[PDB]
């Protein structure tokens, strides 16, 4: 070897990383490839390559070169590859690059070239590859380009060319590749591509063309065409007429609106077709001749019918997306053997016939969501064995067959409301992902990881829960009902605060019935709260229960609010008091009946609680707020009398009742405002237990306060009871 740079190889000297200028002196005179790229050479002096007469490849990329002497490239008669990218010039080298008749590849990209002298490219009789991209050219150098009949590749991308004049490339009979993308081309003349008979690739992406080019009817050898990311909106009828060998067409990212019926026909080499956004298309395109398609995509159009002759000639077809159309009849699919993916979402399909889905061995993904399908026969599913995804959602289904779908891996059936039946768990063994219409469904339905994800709010086995709670609620029904019985009999039998005592007695009766309904409901369905859930939560039971709870809870509180005022007023008006009691029952009835008309309520827990999970922050939130608003005034008046015989007993009886009510009403409210304070997470079933335990708790304890603990008028009635005895 010789000199101090790398120099390693067979006649191949590589001094790229480190150097300055003048090229390495002292090198062998038989060097055939010099790579001095990425250095600080800014100018080539005259006769700067006189020690390398046999050099064939020269690389000068990455330098700061800005001046080439006309006689610098003298004696390089064997040079074949010259790279000059990433350097700086304002003219095509020109003069210096005239004695390079053996030159074949020339790179002039990434420079600041903005003018092409008319005398350039005169002397290069063997040029094959030319790079002219990443520059500031504003027009096609037609005249200089008419000196290279042997040119094979040409790139003019990333420039500022506005239009192509007539007969621009009328002398390149060997060009195979042409790139014109990332320019500002917006107009093309009629006679602009004449003489390009050997051209195979055309790129016109990222331009501002306004109308489909009619000049493409001159390239019979054209195979790949791309014109995506343009402003083409209308494709004329009969466009690709002179290009029978087309195999790839890119036309996406365009505001297409209309496509001619007889436009894609008679294209036997095309393998894919993706059209999206053709709003003003209402007929299926003609495809008599294009029988080699492997992916067909037609979405966003007004196509309402399909010609079933389609799944005939298209022998091979792998994906099909006909979404976002007005299709209502599913024309048979027998014949598309190679078809694998079908997308038919967002259409007007209403039925599914026996023969709709057959000849589908290789199906694997099916999508039928949002079609308003309501009738599905027991057929058109056996013929499709290897099917994994079955998306039928937001439809109007009433009965889902389970035959031939044992091989599914992901099922989506969420959105249907008329499907209240229970799906068989033995027919979806291989199923891994499930979504169902309801929770009971989930319930019922519930590594599967179902979407509803039932919790304590939706139990699958025990309504009430632990046997303890079960033994606790049986005792309340047996006590309250019977206890709240004789009390009213006395008052009812024999026509002050004594009234609100009977009035409070009545308020309890309704609450007990609610609990009894809940308990009876718990005893009928034991260890089987799966098929009794949907019927219970999407039907009349829940409403009645929610008015006997709301009517009874709210009524008691409201009723409990009038007795305190009565004592306060005693320590004439008798007439008014009756009228006041009749108005509370009516409100309680309204307050109770108000939620029976709006949507989403009495549908959060199987107990039909007023505020379960608080998922109505209206009445439920207002009810809790009103419960306390009302609770506040009673406590205020109590502290007020506190500030300063029978009356004492009544008073004592009433205080025991409110204290007891106030003491017993604290957890219900406390559980209502969980998200604000997070309450250290949510009671898994404790809330239910608490809610279950505490919400009807006053309905028994309260009435016992004056029963014998405070025998005032109640003791008079007990003595009256002994009298009846």
């Amino acid at each position: 070897c010789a000199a101090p740079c790398s120099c390693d190889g067979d006649r191949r000297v590589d001094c790229s990383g480190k150097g300055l200028t003048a090229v390495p002196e002292g090198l062998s005179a038989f060097t055939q490839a010099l790579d001095i790229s990425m250095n600080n050479i800014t100018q080539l002096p005259e006769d700067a390559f006189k020690n390398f007469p046999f050099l064939e490849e020269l690389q000068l990329a990455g330098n700061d070169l800005s001046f080439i002497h006309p006689k610098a490239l003298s004696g390089l008669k064997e040079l074949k590859v010259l790279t000059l990218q990433n350097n700086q010039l304002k003219t095509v080298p020109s003069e210096a690059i005239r004695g390079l008749s053996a030159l074949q590849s020339l790179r002039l990209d990434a420079n600041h070239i903005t003018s092409v002298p008319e005398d350039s490219f005169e002397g290069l009789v063997q040029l094959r590859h030319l790079w002219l991209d990443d520059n500031s050219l504003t027009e096609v150098p037609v005249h200089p380009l008419s000196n290279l009949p042997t040119l094979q590749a040409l790139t003019l991308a990333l420039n500022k060319i506005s239009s192509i004049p007539d007969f621009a490339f009328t002398n390149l009979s060997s060009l195979v590749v042409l790139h014109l993308h990332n320019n500002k081309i917006r107009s093309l003349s009629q006679h602009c591509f004449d003489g390009l008979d050997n051209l195979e690739t055309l790129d016109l992406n990222y331009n501002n063309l306004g109308e489909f080019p009619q000049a493409i009817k001159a390239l019979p050898s054209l195979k790949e065409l791309g014109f995506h990311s343009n402003s083409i909106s209308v494709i004329p009828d009969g466009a690709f007429d002179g290009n029978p060998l087309l195999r790839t067409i890119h036309l996406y990212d365009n505001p297409l609106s209309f496509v001619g019926n007889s436009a894609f026909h008679n294209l036997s080499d095309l393998h894919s077709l993706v059209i999206r956004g053709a709003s003003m298309v209402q007929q299926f395109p003609n495809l008599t001749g294009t029988v080699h398609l492997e992916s067909l995509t037609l979405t966003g159009t007004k196509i309402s019918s399909i010609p079933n002759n389609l799944c005939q000639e298209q022998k091979m077809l792998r994906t099909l997306d006909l979404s976002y159309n007005n299709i209502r009849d599913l024309p048979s699919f027998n014949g598309c053997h190679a078809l694998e993916e079908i997308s038919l979402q967002r259409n007007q399909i209403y039925q599914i016939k026996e023969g709709t889905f057959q000849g589908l061995i290789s199906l694997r993904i099916l999508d039928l969501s949002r079609n308003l399908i309501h009738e599905i026969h027991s057929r058109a599913f056996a013929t499709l064995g290897p099917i994994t995804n079955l998306d039928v959602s937001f439809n109007e289904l009433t009965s889902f067959p389970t035959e031939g779908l044992n091989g599914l891996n992901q099922l989506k059936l969420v959105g249907n409301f008329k499907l209240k039946e229970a799906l068989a768990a033995k027919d979806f063994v291989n199923l891994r992902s499930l979504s169902v219409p309801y929770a009971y469904q989930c319930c019922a339905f519930w590594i599967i990881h179902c979407t509803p994800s039932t919790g304590a709010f939706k139990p699958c086995e025990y309504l009430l829960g632990s046997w303890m709670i079960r033994l606790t609620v049986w005792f309340i029904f047996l006590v309250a009902l019977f206890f709240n019985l004789l009390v009213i009999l006395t008052t009812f039998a024999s026509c002050s605060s004594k009234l609100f005592i009977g009035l409070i007695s009545v308020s309890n009766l309704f609450m007990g019935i609610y609990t009894g309904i809940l308990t009876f409901l718990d005893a009928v369905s034991w260890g089987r709260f799966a098929e009794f859930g949907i019927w219970w939560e999407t039907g009349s039971g829940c409403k009645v229960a929610g008015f006997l709870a709301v009517f009874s809870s709210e009524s008691a509180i409201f009723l409990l609010m009038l007795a305190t005022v009565e004592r306060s007023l005693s320590a004439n008006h008798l007439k008014q008091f009756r009228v006041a009691a009749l108005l509370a029952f009516l409100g309680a009835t309204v307050a109770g009946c108000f939620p029976l008309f709006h949507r989403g309520e009495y549908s959060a827990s199987p107990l039909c609680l007023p505020f379960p999970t608080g998922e109505s922050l209206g009445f439920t939130v207002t009810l809790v707020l009103l419960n306390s608003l009302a609770f506040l005034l009673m406590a205020v008046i109590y502290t007020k009398l506190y500030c300063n015989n029978s009356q004492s007993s009544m008073i004592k009886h009433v205080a025991w009742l409110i204290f007891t009510n106030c003491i017993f009403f604290c957890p219900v409210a406390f559980f209502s405002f969980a998200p604000l304070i997070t309450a250290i997470s949510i009671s898994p079933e404790i809330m239910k237990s608490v809610t279950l335990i505490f919400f009807p708790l006053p309905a028994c304890l309260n009435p016992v306060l004056y029963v014998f603990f405070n025998p005032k008028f109640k003791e008079d009635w007990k003595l009256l009871k002994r009298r009846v005895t």
Binding site: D10, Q104, H181
Partner: protein, 100 residues
Amino acid sequence: SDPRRCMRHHYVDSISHPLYKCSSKMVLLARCEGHCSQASRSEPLVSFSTVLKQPFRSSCHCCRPQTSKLKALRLRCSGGMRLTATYRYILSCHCEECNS
């Protein structure tokens, strides 16, 4: 310098990503092609033991790269991201045995 020896050629190739929307690139590549003058043969291998592990001792010569570089190209796709393509540019070519 027979015009049919094992020498290296050039050509422009078309590079573009198959999934993402990427602006295509023209890449100059090299390739080796030509006839080697060493004739290829295949002889029988005789053995006095009892099993034929290898029954023939071949020779064959082929024109294969000797020294390649690894250059890469950042196809500049759109909407962020810059996928990267890599290849080895044949620096030289010679005739070597197929197996060895």
